[PDB]
Amino acid sequence: RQEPPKIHLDCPGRIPDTIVVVAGNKLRLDVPISGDPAPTVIWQKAITQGNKAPARPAPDAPEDTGDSDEWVFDKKLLCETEGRVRVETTKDRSIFTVEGAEKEDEGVYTVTVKNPVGEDQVNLTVKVID
């Protein structure tokens, strides 16, 4: 009995989902969203490797090491550490402010907004500068 959730703000409906930091610096990200009063914007991460349905991308065997991820095995439940990353949802929007977004955080992310009326999704681009 509220408003339909959506990745929109007041008109252009364009959430600047872009978290950037200078490698080990205090970064703050603010993005307005729909939903009322407070929706559920979960900040998800994306490594664009190869999953979900099938796909026929371009054959570009890129030589590399392939060791950016790790063996988390179970599900990482401890997200916000004591002083590593702080992600909280404001009263009517999502905020991504982390003071340690290193190369391990760089890559791509997919934030999802949900509520009792509906749900939406979007991609967040990250970039750690030195």
Curated annotation (Swiss-Prot):
PTM per Swiss-Prot/TrEMBL: Substrate for phosphorylation by PKA and PKC. Reversible phosphorylation appears to modulate contraction.
Species whose genome carries this gene: Homo sapiens
UniProt protein name: Myosin-binding protein C, cardiac-type
Function: Thick filament-associated protein located in the crossbridge region of vertebrate striated muscle a bands. In vitro it binds MHC, F-actin and native thin filaments, and modifies the activity of actin-activated myosin ATPase. It may modulate muscle contraction or may play a more structural role.
Domain Ig-like C2-type, residue spans: 5-130
Source domain of life: Eukaryota
Record family assignment: Belongs to the immunoglobulin superfamily. MyBP family.
Medical condition linked: Cardiomyopathy, familial hypertrophic, 4: A hereditary heart disorder characterized by ventricular hypertrophy, which is usually asymmetric and often involves the interventricular septum. The symptoms include dyspnea, syncope, collapse, palpitations, and chest pain. They can be readily provoked by exercise. The disorder has inter- and intrafamilial variability ranging from benign to malignant forms with high risk of cardiac failure and sudden cardiac death. Cardiomyopathy, dilated, 1MM: A disorder characterized by ventricular dilation and impaired systolic function, resulting in congestive heart failure and arrhythmia. Patients are at risk of premature death.
